Structures are given as structure tokens and as C-alpha cells.
Amino acid sequence: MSIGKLLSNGALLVDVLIIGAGPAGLSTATGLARQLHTAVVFDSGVYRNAKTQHMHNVLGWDHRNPAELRAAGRADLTTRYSTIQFQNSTIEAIRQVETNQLFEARDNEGHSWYGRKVVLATGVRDIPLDIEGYSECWANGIYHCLFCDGYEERGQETVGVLALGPIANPARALHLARMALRLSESVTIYTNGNEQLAKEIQQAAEESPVGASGLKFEARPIRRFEKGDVAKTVIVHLGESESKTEGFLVYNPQTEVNGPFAKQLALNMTEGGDILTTPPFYETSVPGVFAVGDCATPLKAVTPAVSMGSLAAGGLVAQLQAQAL
Amino acid sequence: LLVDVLIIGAGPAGLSTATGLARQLHTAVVFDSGVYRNAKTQHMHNVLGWDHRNPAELRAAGRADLTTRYSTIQFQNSTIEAIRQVETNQLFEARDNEGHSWYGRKVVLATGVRDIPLDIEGYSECWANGIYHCLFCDGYEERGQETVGVLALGPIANPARALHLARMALRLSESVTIYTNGNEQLAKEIQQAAEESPVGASGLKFEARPIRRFEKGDVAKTVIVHLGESESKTEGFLVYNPQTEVNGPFAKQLALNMTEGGDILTTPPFYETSVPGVFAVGDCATPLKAVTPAVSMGSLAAGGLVAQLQAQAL
Ligand SMILES: Cc1cc2nc3c(=O)[nH]c(=O)nc-3n(C[C@H](O)[C@H](O)[C@H](O)COP(=O)(O)OP(=O)(O)OC[C@H]3O[C@@H](n4cnc5c(N)ncnc54)[C@H](O)[C@@H]3O)c2cc1C
Ligand SMILES: Cc1cc2nc3c(=O)[nH]c(=O)nc-3n(C[C@H](O)[C@H](O)[C@H](O)COP(=O)(O)OP(=O)(O)OC[C@H]3O[C@@H](n4cnc5c(N)ncnc54)[C@H](O)[C@@H]3O)c2cc1C
């Protein structure tokens, strides 16, 4: 290579291997660059929000393409700084060769990279509902985050909430339905064949201080989703032969962390599949390995991802400067 | 005038909070007295997508985004003098410097902090101009020094803080002198801690003489530190993270729990204060005083506000 310190195997050793060039990884690299620390940032080119044209709820970046944030971040990292190296390849394996001290990353081309520390910023993959038409409607009628979307489609007569998967409880369903009520006159909560749940959600709503006004409950099984002709509408085909048109649908899917690294490094995971990290610096259960962004928090958004990246760099700088080379 | 949220502050923290609320069509009045902690700076660093940009540009973009595409966020360029609760979590009243009152279901305090100067002649002249508080914020621009100083005074007067800063300053300078302003016991403790640490004390010097005054040098960001009676040392720049105090009387008026540093005590995931319905975000509510945490706090605060407004009666 051309940056870092030589090892006995013939390779150069950088301070940090950052696996990910979304906002989380780019923000981590941003902090390191301030203190002249070296990093190889890997990018497989798989971004969770690749299906979108417009970012929201990111201060100063309203309605901008998420690709623009990544481009600005990359430009900022190579223009006034020269310690940050970008590698467009997919990491297939990571191993700790020395405790907290040396890590090896191997890519899809057979090439090896060495860092004193590792940052996992691989993001997550959204798991589709096994229902016909779901894939056509995802991020195009079915929305997961009403801070991220929904405002553009406000003023509806009726929209739906899918109380399925992780939304199949009164807390999540009601929180999402009440958010949807800001955007629609009426909200129908779909339970896909769970009457008991529909009853639980209704009762919880009726028994809550604000009540159940504006809410509809649909317990019938869902046969398929059809992308309606107009705007972001989705026709939900229920039972044998009835259907209903909704302005759009709200569903926050189950996710899984991208890459095999939690398995390979035996990193503690959350019940939800996320890599378990602890504030203040978001170090994982193996020292010297950090995790930031979607792969390491239930707060899966751009501003928390960038914040995690900054704080991780603070911790990395501390470790790099306090620990013998 | 009753809105959902009275937001006191239009820095990154307040603006981020408003950005969140606007997505869900919640109403807010954002107050701005026009006093920003980084008012003295031309170049913001360590904020993804904004390297070397003017911090005023971030505030301008955040304001423009909110006024352009959203209609539920109001801005008031006035100073708030007093806030009080009218009914428990039900209602808050903010009184401005013109004797107008505003009512909100909730309140966000995003007032920032004021950096307390050292009581040493010449400090004021050298602040953010030779004396730097955050080596992620600055320092990189003045790299390649022969010598720089760390002021191990106030909150930096302990081996951990002094060594952490000194090792950061060593990235930017051949040598770092740690000043203890007359505390010889501290100088020795810092040296031993460095000497006994895994990385050692190489590149560090220790200066325990009392500091009489700071004189800003004519060249670049240099500061002449006047020691003893007549002796002096010229540094490339000095590094010191000051004690801070929250802006505004609101933590006192509402009797909000404070941290041991004087910040408003808040807790993730939503940064609500010790008084239900009052939130605090950004510098006034965290020891992590930087733009990206301030912005993230604003977003999460908006999530908690959104949750309460929609689960509680109007
Ligand atoms: C449809 C949709 C819309 C959204 N809209 C918004 C919005 O408006 N506002 C908002 O704040 N949030 C939004 N989000 C959430 C947002 O996308 C995430 O919070 C954010 O992208 C997380 O950033 P990250 O860096 O953690 O992961 P990502 O941005 O997904 O980046 C992951 C990086 O890791 C890399 N990677 C993964 N595995 C490997 C490997 N083995 N080797 C090398 N590289 C690897 C990828 O190539 C990629 O570069 C949206 C999400 C979705 C699905
Ligand atoms: C010299 C210097 C350089 C810095 N450089 C960087 C950097 O490069 N990168 C970085 O990330 N961070 C930097 N910081 C830290 C950064 O400035 C803060 O983290 C950030 O400004 C916090 O934002 P905030 O919204 O919490 O407070 P502020 O940005 O200070 O805004 C506070 C708001 O509250 C308002 N307000 C206060 N009291 C009242 C009242 N009574 N009525 C009405 N309104 C009121 C003010 O008018 C203002 O609008 C720097 C700080 C300093 C001092």
C-alpha cells in the first residue's frame, strides 16, 4: 500500500478499517481525519435507502438525494484530508490476529487489509413480508418511517397500518396509527388474520387518554397488495373477494445486519439482530471493534448514524493515542 | 397563541427538533435571540457534508428548509425571559422581552452554553484565536507546530483530561507543554501517569509556574504565555476546554435537575428533562458539545415530543 506502518508479513497497517461508506462510516472517517489518523473505508455499494430520491429529517438536507450526502462526505474526506483511503470492494471476512491490537479484513478479490481497529458500519437489509405484491409496493406505497416519508402524501381520506411482524402489538401499531392520523382522515389497522390482536389494539386505544377516534380495525387475512394506479395508493386484497384502497400503507419491517462479521467475531447481538454497542463510543463486545449506524442501533436514521460515527471516532482516537503501536 | 411546542433556540439543536416536528405537521414557535456559541468562527469541522463551511450556513439552510416546504413551524426573533407551567404537563407559557406571551403543550430548551473565561489577563483576546477548546473542531488547520500548550486548569486540571488533550495536540505539534498554573503536585501526577502509561511521556513537557497573562503573538495563532515574574514561553497555540454555563434562566425557573457540570440533565432515548413535557437538546443538555450530537438529539427529542403529543389529550 502507501499509508500506514509496516508489518512483518509485508503489508502496511492503518489505524482503522471502516466497513461501510454510508453516513455512519463516512462520519467515523470524518472524525479520524481531523486527528490525522489513517483509515481504509470499504464500500460494497449497497445502501439501505437506494430506492429513494429524497432524504428528510436531516438538518440542512431536506428533500435532497441521499447519494448527494455520500458524495459530499467522500469529497470532504479527500479534498482537505489525505489519510482516508477508499476501497470499492466487499469484505468477506474479518479476524482479530491480536487482542484489541490487530485486525485483518479479506475482500472478495482475495486481498488482505490490516488495521489497529475495526468499525462495522454495514447497515441493515429490510426483510420483505411474504405477501404477493409487497416488493412492488415497498418504498412505493408502503412506508416504514413517517419522519422519513409520509408528509409528501398528506391529506389522505384513508391510509393503512400493517400490524404484522414486529408491528403486531398494541404499542407499535397504535404509535404508527396515531402518526398516520396526522396525514389521513382515517387509519385502518390491518392484522392479517389476528382478531385477538385487533381487539387488543382497539381496547388499548379506547382505554387510552386520547381514545380511538379515527381508527378502523381490519382483522381479515391479506391475500395480496396491488400497487394502485394513482400516486402512492395500495389496494389491499382481503379475504376471498373483497379489497380496499388505501392512500398508502405504513409498515416497519424486521431487519438484519449486512455481512457475516457479528458471527465471525462472535459479537453480542440484540434480540432484534443489531450489533450490541454501548454509549459513549459504541464499542462492541470485542474491544477494538466498534459498530455504528443502522447495524448497531434501533434508532435507524441518518442523524443518529452520523452522531454515532462522530462519537465512535472520539473513542477510536482515544484508544489509538493511549495504546502502544 | 397555542402551539404544540415552544422551542427556545434556533441553533442546530433547536432547528433539528423543529425539522422533526414539521414532518408530522406539529406546530411550533422557534425563538432565536441570535446568540450562538460558535458565533466567532468562520469554519465548521467534523460535521458530515459540511467540512470547512460557515456554521451560519447550516443555520440558514435549516431555516430555509423549514420555511420553504413546511408551514407549521413559526420563527420568532426575540429573547425569552421566563417560562412557567400553567397546568401540569398540560400547558407552558413563555414570556419574551417585549411582554408577549406564547403558550405550548410542550417546551424544548435548546439555548446552548456560554464558555466561561479564565480570570487571567489576555485570555479574552486569545479565545478562539490562539486558544482552542476542541481538537475535532479546530487544530488540524494549525498543524505542524514546533510547540503548543495545554492549559491543565479548571476542568482540565486532572491527569486524564490533560493527557487526553496533550496526546491530541501531539498529532499537531512536535512538542506539547502542559501548563498547571502553580500546581506542582498536578504537574508531577500528570508526568507520572504519562511515564507509567503504555505509550509513555515522549514529546511532553510540564510547566508548573503560575501564569501572569496571555499575550497574543503577532505571528499566526501564537500565544506568549507569561510565566513567573519575567519569564515567558511562546506557543503555536493553546488548548483549553472551558467550564460552561447554560444560557437562560429556565433550568432555575422550572427547577430542572442539573448535571455536575451545570448542564440540564436529560436521558435518552428522547432527552426529556426532570419535568414532564420539558425537553432539552444540544449543548445545554449534554457534555457532548458538538454539532452532530446536537442535531441527533434534536431528531430524537422530536420523536419523543411526537409520541407525547399524540398520546395525550389536547
Ligand atoms: C426507503 C428508505 C427511506 C429512508 N429515508 C430516510 C430519510 O429520509 N431520512 C433518514 O434520516 N433516514 C432514512 N432512512 C434510513 C437510512 O437509510 C439509514 O438510517 C442510513 O442509511 C444508515 O446509514 P449506515 O451508514 O448505517 O448504512 P447505509 O447507509 O445502508 O450504508 C451501509 C454501507 O455499508 C457497506 N457494506 C455493507 N456490507 C459490506 C461488506 N461486506 N463490505 C463492504 N461494504 C459493506 C455498504 O456498501 C454501504 O456502503 C431510510 C431507509 C429506507 C429503507
Ligand atoms: C469557537 C467554537 C468553535 C466550534 N467549532 C465547532 C465545529 O467545528 N464543529 C462542531 O461540531 N462544533 C463546534 N463547536 C460547538 C458548537 O458550537 C455547538 O455544539 C453547537 O453550536 C450547539 O448547538 P445548540 O443549538 O445546542 O446551541 P447554539 O448553536 O449555541 O444555539 C443556541 C440558540 O439558543 C438561543 N437562545 C439562547 N437563549 C435564549 C433565550 N433566552 N431566548 C431565545 N433564544 C435563546 C440562541 O439565540 C441560539 O439561537 C464550536 C464551539 C465554539 C465555541
UniProtKB/Swiss-Prot annotation, chain A:
Q: Phenotype on deletion?
A: Impairs gliotoxin oxidation, leading to unchecked methylation and subsequent significant S-adenosylmethionine (SAM) depletion and S-adenosylhomocysteine (SAH) overproduction which in turn significantly contributes to hypersensitivity to gliotoxin of gliT-deficient A.fumigatus. Results in altered expression of over 200 genes involved in many functions.
Q: Which Cys residues form disulphide pairs?
A: C145-C148
* Claim: Metal-binding is one of the keywords in the record: no
Tell me, in a sentence or two, what this protein's role is. Thioredoxin reductase; part of the gene cluster that mediates the biosynthesis of gliotoxin, a member of the epipolythiodioxopiperazine (ETP) class of toxins characterized by a disulfide bridged cyclic dipeptide. The first step in gliotoxin biosynthesis is the condensation of serine and phenylalanine to form the cyclo-L-phenylalanyl-L-serine diketopiperazine (DKP) by the NRPS gliP. GliP is also able to produce the DKP cyclo-L-tryptophanyl-L-serine, suggesting that the substrate specificity of the first adenylation (A) domain in gliP is sufficiently relaxed to accommodate both L-Phe and L-Trp.
- Name the family: Belongs to the class-II pyridine nucleotide-disulfide oxidoreductase family.
Query: Which PANTHER family does this one have?
Result: THIOREDOXIN REDUCTASE 1-RELATED-RELATED
Q: What is this protein called?
A: Thioredoxin reductase gliT
Q: Which organism is it from?
A: Aspergillus fumigatus (strain ATCC MYA-4609 / CBS 101355 / FGSC A1100 / Af293) (Neosartorya fumigata)
Q: Lineage from the top down?
A: Eukaryota, Fungi, Dikarya, Ascomycota, Pezizomycotina
Name the gene.
gliT
